[PDB]
Amino acid sequence: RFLKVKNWETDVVLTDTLHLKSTLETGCTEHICMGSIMLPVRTKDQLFPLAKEFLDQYYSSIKRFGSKAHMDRLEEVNKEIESTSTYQLKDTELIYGAKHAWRNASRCVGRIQWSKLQVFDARDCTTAHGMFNYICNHVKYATNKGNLRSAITIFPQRTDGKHDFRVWNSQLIRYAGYKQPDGSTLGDPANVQFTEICIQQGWKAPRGRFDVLPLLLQANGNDPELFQIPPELVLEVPIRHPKFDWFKDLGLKWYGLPAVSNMLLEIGGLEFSACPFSGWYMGTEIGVRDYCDNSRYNILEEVAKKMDLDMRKTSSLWKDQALVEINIAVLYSFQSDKVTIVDHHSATESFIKHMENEYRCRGGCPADWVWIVPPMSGSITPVFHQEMLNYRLTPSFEYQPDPWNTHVWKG
Amino acid sequence: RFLKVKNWETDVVLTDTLHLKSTLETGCTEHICMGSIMLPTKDQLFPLAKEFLDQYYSSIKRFGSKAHMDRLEEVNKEIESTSTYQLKDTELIYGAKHAWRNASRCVGRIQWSKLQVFDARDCTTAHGMFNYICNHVKYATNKGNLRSAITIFPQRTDGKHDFRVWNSQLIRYAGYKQPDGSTLGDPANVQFTEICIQQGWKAPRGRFDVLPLLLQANGNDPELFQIPPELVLEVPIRHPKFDWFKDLGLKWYGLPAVSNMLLEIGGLEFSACPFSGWYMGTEIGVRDYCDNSRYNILEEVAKKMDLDMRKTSSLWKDQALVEINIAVLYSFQSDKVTIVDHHSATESFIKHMENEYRCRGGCPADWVWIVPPMSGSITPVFHQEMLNYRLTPSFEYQPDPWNTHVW
Numbered sequence A: 001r002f003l004k005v006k007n008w009e010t011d012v013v014l015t016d017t018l019h020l021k022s023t024l025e026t027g028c029t030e031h032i033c034m035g036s037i038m039l040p041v042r043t044k045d046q047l048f049p050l051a052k053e054f055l056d057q058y059y060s061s062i063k064r065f066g067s068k069a070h071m072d073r074l075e076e077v078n079k080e081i082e083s084t085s086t087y088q089l090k091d092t093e094l095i096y097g098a099k100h101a102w103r104n105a106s107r108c109v110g111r112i113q114w115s116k117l118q119v120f121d122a123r124d125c126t127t128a129h130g131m132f133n134y135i136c137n138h139v140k141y142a143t144n145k146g147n148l149r150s151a152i153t154i155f156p157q158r159t160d161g162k163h164d165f166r167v168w169n170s171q172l173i174r175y176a177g178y179k180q181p182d183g184s185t186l187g188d189p190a191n192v193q194f195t196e197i198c199i200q201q202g203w204k205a206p207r208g209r210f211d212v213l214p215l216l217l218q219a220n221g222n223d224p225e226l227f228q229i230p231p232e233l234v235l236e237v238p239i240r241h242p243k244f245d246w247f248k249d250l251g252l253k254w255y256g257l258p259a260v261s262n263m264l265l266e267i268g269g270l271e272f273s274a275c276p277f278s279g280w281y282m283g284t285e286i287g288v289r290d291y292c293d294n295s296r297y298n299i300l301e302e303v304a305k306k307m308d309l310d311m312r313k314t315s316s317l318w319k320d321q322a323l324v325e326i327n328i329a330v331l332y333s334f335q336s337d338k339v340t341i342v343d344h345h346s347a348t349e350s351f352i353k354h355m356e357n358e359y360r361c362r363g364g365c366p367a368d369w370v371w372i373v374p375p376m377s378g379s380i381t382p383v384f385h386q387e388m389l390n391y392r393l394t395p396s397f398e399y400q401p402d403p404w405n406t407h408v409w410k411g
Numbered sequence B: 001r002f003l004k005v006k007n008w009e010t011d012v013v014l015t016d017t018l019h020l021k022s023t024l025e026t027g028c029t030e031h032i033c034m035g036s037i038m039l040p041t042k043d044q045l046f047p048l049a050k051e052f053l054d055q056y057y058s059s060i061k062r063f064g065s066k067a068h069m070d071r072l073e074e075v076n077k078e079i080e081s082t083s084t085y086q087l088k089d090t091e092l093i094y095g096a097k098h099a100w101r102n103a104s105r106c107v108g109r110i111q112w113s114k115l116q117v118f119d120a121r122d123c124t125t126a127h128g129m130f131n132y133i134c135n136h137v138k139y140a141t142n143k144g145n146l147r148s149a150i151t152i153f154p155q156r157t158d159g160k161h162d163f164r165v166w167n168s169q170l171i172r173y174a175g176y177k178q179p180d181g182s183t184l185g186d187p188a189n190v191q192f193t194e195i196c197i198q199q200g201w202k203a204p205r206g207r208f209d210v211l212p213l214l215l216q217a218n219g220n221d222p223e224l225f226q227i228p229p230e231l232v233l234e235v236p237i238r239h240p241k242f243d244w245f246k247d248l249g250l251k252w253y254g255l256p257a258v259s260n261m262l263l264e265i266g267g268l269e270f271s272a273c274p275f276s277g278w279y280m281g282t283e284i285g286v287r288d289y290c291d292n293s294r295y296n297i298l299e300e301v302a303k304k305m306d307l308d309m310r311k312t313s314s315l316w317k318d319q320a321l322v323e324i325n326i327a328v329l330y331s332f333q334s335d336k337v338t339i340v341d342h343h344s345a346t347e348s349f350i351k352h353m354e355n356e357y358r359c360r361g362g363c364p365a366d367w368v369w370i371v372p373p374m375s376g377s378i379t380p381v382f383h384q385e386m387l388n389y390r391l392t393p394s395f396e397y398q399p400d401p402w403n404t405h406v407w
Ligand code: HEM
Pocket: A098, A102, A105, A107, A108, A109, A110, A111, A113, A117, A150, A151, A152, A263, A277, A278, A279, A280, A281, A282, A285, A342, A347, A371, A397
């Protein structure tokens, strides 16, 4: 079977065969497309197939498919699963696995970078204090004084699902949000609930607009524990505008390191419930979403007032104008301080080259158009006009429920 | 099997039950999503008719009535005897309005019940088609106070006698390839212009030449007709602060009017059914002007603005884009030609969508098309989950007729 995708700007047509390896489901059927829906313990029985499929992939990639080493490794994992009910990945398999979960991440525009990923193996970790130390080292390595380096840290896999490692933070670095009695919000409205949990667990909140949240770390299924990331490890950029001198007085700043900590990494049927990973920002994640979503810092109106735009009618495009200026400011600021950042033109162009390369060398590149297209200026980026096919390959990153909904409190 | 959609900005959650009445296929499977692919006998006809007339009689609250049973029997006898049937005027009007209502890619559906339907089923020649189309254009244009309309030519019979408008829109600009190797005019219309030239059109060879209509009646060879120039309302494009903008020599036409789609009602196929509304600004300012494969003017505008075009990260493309879109809205407004901006249009669509969930149990919507091509996430549709599925009556794509027509 061959599926074809067209680029409507270039008329370039690509042929996908890779979708023949998809397994998980999309959410869609022949009768309903769920392409814009945000959220669409295993037995021995299901596990060996999942292991075998992964190991066949790994051994093929190293050009040892069907070798003695390959056969011995299948046998060894088979027996391990039979007597212990799970198995342990070799370091090389873990590295390959983590890289491939990124490569397979259909919502990620940054995948040209997938093969450069520093993998920190934290499977010897046993306590929350151990987790903290691992996470500080990740943050310090990844930050690299502004010259950002992609990295992932992987904590022990799930066993009975009663002993899970979890980072309760959605990202390693994020700002607190506090709902005020008057119904307004100080800081980041997205993190209000998590901030209440931190406070309830005994965090002493500074109660400012940009308070870096503490880490809340669960090891081996125990109750989570609080830790403050050392401030000197948290690189931040004050936001200023190249021509507008009043922009700095809005008091805005952001952190340099985007680091997702709430996802589940699946490799060969194993589940790594704590696997924080980080890269560097595309400017629109801060300038469009973090700053301009109505449910976030929501600064559009204030910016447009200061620019003296005509705000009496939407048709003056005042919002569009302020939006662009805010995004110029974010890129200017990061660049001026030498903190790695990529604009949405550069990132989507690199993504299309990556995608074409993948079709040629791998036979496809699953991609989720809804997420890949940037949240401003969509159609003047080359991804807008590119047809894409979304399907699920393993290894993969998956959503998991927030741990405060599922955690069995010990006390 | 009953589905929830959430808005991630407002936390409003709606339940879709309408999708259970969905009929055609999406292109998607449980293994692969094709959400971003642009194009993913008496026996068959009676169920299609019944399904339609049932929904019709339900809508006027006469479901199961004698008049309902009588029409069903009437239509059944007509199909068995004639191999087809004819819609009552009321059914035709209901069906055309519902095809718009069901158009999952249309942001402007709050307006769906205000559609003037022109019944041209009595039309027999290409000359007749031309007269009907001029009247549509004039009625819909209304000197700039635009009114939604559709004109419906006779339905398909044996498929050898199709009515077709060969143009993709009633009003579009010609495209010509130059000795230079560049393109003069609209690059999207190069092929269609060639056919027009080939059929005899005398091309002016300008940058904004309104194409002639190429009209096919009763499966005959199509004929050329020029729309009276005084019926084509055009708008010169200027900017409220940039004095130099008018010197780019840009204009666009006021009436967006799709002419290449097929309207299916109760199994009957209307292969020529031009329909028109009014523009959302970004259709002209982002797509028509700024697509690389269309008028592609970003670079010229950026240069006149004197932006740093050395690096993508100065966001010069984005700045010039916004300015071009301001100019479009400004020019249409100054000349009192109806236009809607993408903020106002998407806000209306969210209100429409809540009405439809409340009153109909859902609203099929294709997010990839609903979200405007600029400033996506500052419009409320970006944060709105949508379910895409196909309901009839419907507008459908059909093959370009020159690939199909036996000459
Ligand atoms: C190298 C720099 C990177 C850039 C510029 C980048 C870019 C992005 C962007 C813009 C998004 C969408 C975020 C949003 O709009 O909310 C995203 C999503 C994602 N990326 Fe990346 N990415 C990078 C590195 C990585 C790395 C290192 C990984 C994992 C190893 C990764 C895995 C993911 C995943 C799983 C998603 C989807 C998240 C979700 O569904 O919530 N990315 N990427």
